[PDB]
Amino acid sequence: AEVNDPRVGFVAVVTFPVDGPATQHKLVELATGGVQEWIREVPGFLSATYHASTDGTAVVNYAQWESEQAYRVNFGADPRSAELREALSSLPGLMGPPKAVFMTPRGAILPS
Amino acid sequence: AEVNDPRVGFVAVVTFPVDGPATQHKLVELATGGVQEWIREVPGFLSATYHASTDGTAVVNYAQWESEQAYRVNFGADPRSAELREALSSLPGLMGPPKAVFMTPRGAILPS
Numbered sequence: 001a002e003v004n005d006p007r008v009g010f011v012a013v014v015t016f017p018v019d020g021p022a023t024q025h026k027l028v029e030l031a032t033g034g035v036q037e038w039i040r041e042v043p044g045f046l047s048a049t050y051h052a053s054t055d056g057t058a059v060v061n062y063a064q065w066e067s068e069q070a071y072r073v074n075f076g077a078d079p080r081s082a083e084l085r086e087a088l089s090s091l092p093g094l095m096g097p098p099k100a101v102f103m104t105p106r107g108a109i110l111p112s
Numbered sequence: 113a114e115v116n117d118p119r120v121g122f123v124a125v126v127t128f129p130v131d132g133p134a135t136q137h138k139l140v141e142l143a144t145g146g147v148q149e150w151i152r153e154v155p156g157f158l159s160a161t162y163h164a165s166t167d168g169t170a171v172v173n174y175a176q177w178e179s180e181q182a183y184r185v186n187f188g189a190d191p192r193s194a195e196l197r198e199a200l201s202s203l204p205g206l207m208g209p210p211k212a213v214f215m216t217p218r219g220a221i222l223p224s
């Protein structure tokens with residue numbers, strides 16, 4: 001969604017510490033893989049954008065949800081998200097467990 | 113811009129450590145209060161979205177830029193960026209210097 005689209009009521013920013021650029025590509029390819037297309041149909045899901053830190057040490061997902069309830073239950077209570085969490089945690093090259101920060105969009109500076 | 117727009121070539125995620133929600137509010141109000149009106153017109157600037165972390169301890173800015181070069185030339189090398197940083201670091205309740213992470217968008221999942 002646009003960054004200031006009013007449907008975004010909740011955001012998660014999830015950082016995955018990795019050992020280098022190869023694992024950054026391998027981690028992204030696993031989270032955007034084709035078998036994860038069920039996420040697209042989760043109610044309240046707006047987007048998940050994976051990035052590779054320029055220094056090669058991390059993968060960061062900026063994810064847009066309609067609400068904290070959509071993330072925690074619609075997504076979080078589905079068995080598939082536990083499945084996905086395990087697979088991401090077992091990938092070789094990870095340096096530690098992912099760390100998420102939860103937040104609410106409060107203001108945006110945009111070009112006219 | 114849409115989070116997956118191909119024009120987004122460079123992203124900075126900037127975290128400001130604060131002492132609680134009242135300061136989170138004031139820092140977002142400062143950031144969108146007119147101090148960075150000038151940024152809107154800068155070539156390559158796509159957006160800056162300020163969020164309040166739900167735990168009350170930080171304000172995070174997810175900024176989209178057309179490329180790393182436009183960011184360095186049009187924001188980093190412009191002395192008004194130091195002006196901006198002086199303004200945001202002047203607020204009472206700001207507990208440390210901002211931390212930034214530079215990255216490039218690599219994959220995204222959008223609804224369907």
Ligand SMILES: O=C(O)Cc1ccc2c(c1O)C(=O)c1c(O)cccc1C2=O
Nearest residue numbers: 012014031048063084085088098099100
């Ligand atoms: O829970 C953690 O602590 C780590 C963690 C691992 C994988 C995922 C998440 C996550 O948070 C997400 O948030 C997440 C999201 O918001 C939107 C889409 C996908 C994921 C996702 O695949």
